Amino acid sequence: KDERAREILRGFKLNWMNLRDAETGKILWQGTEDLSVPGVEHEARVPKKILKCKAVSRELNFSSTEQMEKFRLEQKVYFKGQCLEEWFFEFGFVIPNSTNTWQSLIEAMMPASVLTGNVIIETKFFDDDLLVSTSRVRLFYV
Amino acid sequence: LMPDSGAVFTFGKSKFAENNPGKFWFKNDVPVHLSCGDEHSAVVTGNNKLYMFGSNNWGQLGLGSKSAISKPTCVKALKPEKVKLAACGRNHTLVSTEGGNVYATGGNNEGQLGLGDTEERNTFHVISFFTSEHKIKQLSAGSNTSAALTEDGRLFMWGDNSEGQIGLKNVSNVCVPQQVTIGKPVSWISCGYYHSAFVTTDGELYVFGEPENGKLGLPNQLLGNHRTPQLVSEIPEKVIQVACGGEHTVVLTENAVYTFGLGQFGQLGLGTFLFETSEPKVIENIRDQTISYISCGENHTALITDIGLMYTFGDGRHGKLGLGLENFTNHFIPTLCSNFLRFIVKLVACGGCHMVVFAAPH
């Protein structure tokens, strides 16, 4: 289990990520940094108006050398160490040596001036019941 | 080593490799203009060359891609042109040339590139409106907003107007330069994130944009008219410079420095527990100190003194205040950059998570 988790991680790469306004389709944020990498506190600077969005459409582009049965994410939104939201997203079967674009809808308030730099998204990378990695991104609302 | 003319110093997140100490210069060339956006930076040199670095996620560096950049990079495409000025917004860059051409690259969601559309670009595209007739004195750019100020005092703005931040009244946005006039020559322009301000030749300050957090410096009864430029009459003395940040504004007069808006990180410089003000307040701490230049980041501020010393205040994250390598604390009063005490600070620009300084040693 521990060796299999390391094998998946060594062959996994997040190529890019975008955030779109679900109604207009306009990109609010886009990045090329691999935010999935564990042990490093990543940072993202998003427009403060994202908090006014009813729904946000996220696209994740990832590559994986290893086959996966049920690639899925558990995400917790922490504000000053307090969990505000818990999200669950399921991709499913990952064909070995493939690159995939995964689209997910995130549905929605505290002011941006307080949230900025104080919000952490904790992402747990799972294949079925196997925890592959845990990564974190600190959010800035500017 | 470093030439007698000095070096460019970077603080905070410039996205350089490691290491890469955060200091550079140019062979037989000198920096003449600095600009910083939310996550990127521009350096214009005396040989009329343009160097870009920082984030390239929207193609705001104009290098022909959206790939990561980890060092100052010369814009090859603009080499036939004589680059004079640059402005960096949230996700876009504006450039003006001596021959009369103005160029733009990067994000374009609200028409901030001035190209007549909303499609993002990764190379510098000419804005056809501007010709050799328009002698550009100053460029400015905020969050999806753009501005150009000419030598004879005409102001042109474009991009987002959803909160009145480009002063075009009822219009939601424009994708081409539009003139903003109150019937007076404009001497200074600053585009903040969601608000903008200009100074007239007779020393009057005009503000417009999002009527939130007190950043316009206007009394309550005038906040409804935020979509058109309005006079800040509460400042009695003649205004010389204005710098607009994320949620705050900084004003230089021939008597004092004024700040207003949000200051939860110390960016107002008005003391440890003064978190905000809706009316302009004098920074009393530097009342005896003459200030020659003001610069505004998203949530920090820099001031160059009469003799080329620098004071900074605001959010200290990643060392962007330029005070110490180990210090990342927020500063609520203007604090001397003692690391530059043996230096003349000649140019400064403040971004979202970084600051760029041109300084020369004694």
Swiss-Prot record, chain A:
One of its GO terms (biological process) is visual perception. It is found in: Cytoplasm, Cytosol; Cytoplasmic vesicle membrane; Cytoplasm, Cytoskeleton, Cilium basal body. It is a peripheral membrane protein. InterPro entries: Ig_E-set (IPR014756), PDED_dom (IPR008015), PDED_dom_sf (IPR037036), Rhodop-sen_GMP-Pdiesterase_dsu (IPR017287). Keywords: Cell projection, cGMP, Ciliopathy, Cytoplasm, Cytoplasmic vesicle, Cytoskeleton, Joubert syndrome, Membrane, Sensory transduction, Vision. It comes from the Eukaryota. It is linked to Joubert syndrome 22: A disorder presenting with cerebellar ataxia, oculomotor apraxia, hypotonia, neonatal breathing abnormalities and psychomotor delay. Neuroradiologically, it is characterized by cerebellar vermian hypoplasia/aplasia, thickened and reoriented superior cerebellar peduncles, and an abnormally large interpeduncular fossa, giving the appearance of a molar tooth on transaxial slices (molar tooth sign). Additional variable features include retinal dystrophy, renal disease, liver fibrosis, and polydactyly. Belongs to the PDE6D/unc-119 family. Interacts with the prenylated catalytic subunits of PDE6, an oligomer composed of two catalytic chains (PDE6A and PDE6B) and two inhibitory chains (gamma); has no effect on enzyme activity but promotes the release of the prenylated enzyme from cell membrane. Interacts with prenylated GRK1 and GRK7. Interacts with prenylated Ras family members, including RAP2A and RAP2C. Interacts with prenylated RHEB and NRAS. Interacts with prenylated HRAS and KRAS. Interacts with RAB13 (prenylated form); dissociates RAB13 from membranes. Interacts with prenylated INPP5E. This is Retinal rod rhodopsin-sensitive cGMP 3',5'-cyclic phosphodiesterase subunit delta. It comes from Homo sapiens (Human). The lineage of its organism: Eukaryota, Metazoa, Chordata, Craniata, Vertebrata. The gene is PDE6D.
Swiss-Prot record, chain B:
Heart, brain, placenta, lung, liver, muscle, kidney, retina, pancreas and fetal retinal pigment epithelium. Isoform 3 is found only in the retina. Colocalizes with RPGRIP1 in the outer segment of rod photoreceptors and cone outer segments. Prenylated. Interacts with SPATA7. Interacts with CEP290. Interacts with WHRN. Interacts with PDE6D. Interacts with RPGRIP1. Interacts with RPGRIP1L. PDE6D, RPGRIP1 and RPGRIP1L may compete for the same binding sites. Interacts with RAB37 and RAB8A (in GDP-bound forms); functions as GEF for RAB37 and RAB8A. This is X-linked retinitis pigmentosa GTPase regulator. It is linked to Retinitis pigmentosa 3: An X-linked retinal dystrophy belonging to the group of pigmentary retinopathies. Retinitis pigmentosa is characterized by retinal pigment deposits visible on fundus examination and primary loss of rod photoreceptor cells followed by secondary loss of cone photoreceptors. Patients typically have night vision blindness and loss of midperipheral visual field. As their condition progresses, they lose their far peripheral visual field and eventually central vision as well. It comes from Homo sapiens. RCC1 repeats lie at residues 48-99, 100-152, 153-202, 203-255, 256-307, 308-361. Acts as a guanine-nucleotide releasing factor (GEF) for RAB8A and RAB37 by promoting the conversion of inactive RAB-GDP to the active form RAB-GTP. GEF activity towards RAB8A may facilitate ciliary trafficking by modulating ciliary intracellular localization of RAB8A. GEF activity towards RAB37 maintains autophagic homeostasis and retinal function. Involved in photoreceptor integrity. May control cilia formation by regulating actin stress filaments and cell contractility. May be involved in microtubule organization and regulation of transport in primary cilia. It is found in: Cytoplasm, Cytoskeleton, Flagellum axoneme; Golgi apparatus; Cell projection, Cilium. Changing residue 93 to N: In RP3; no change in GEF activity towards RAB8A. It comes from the Eukaryota.
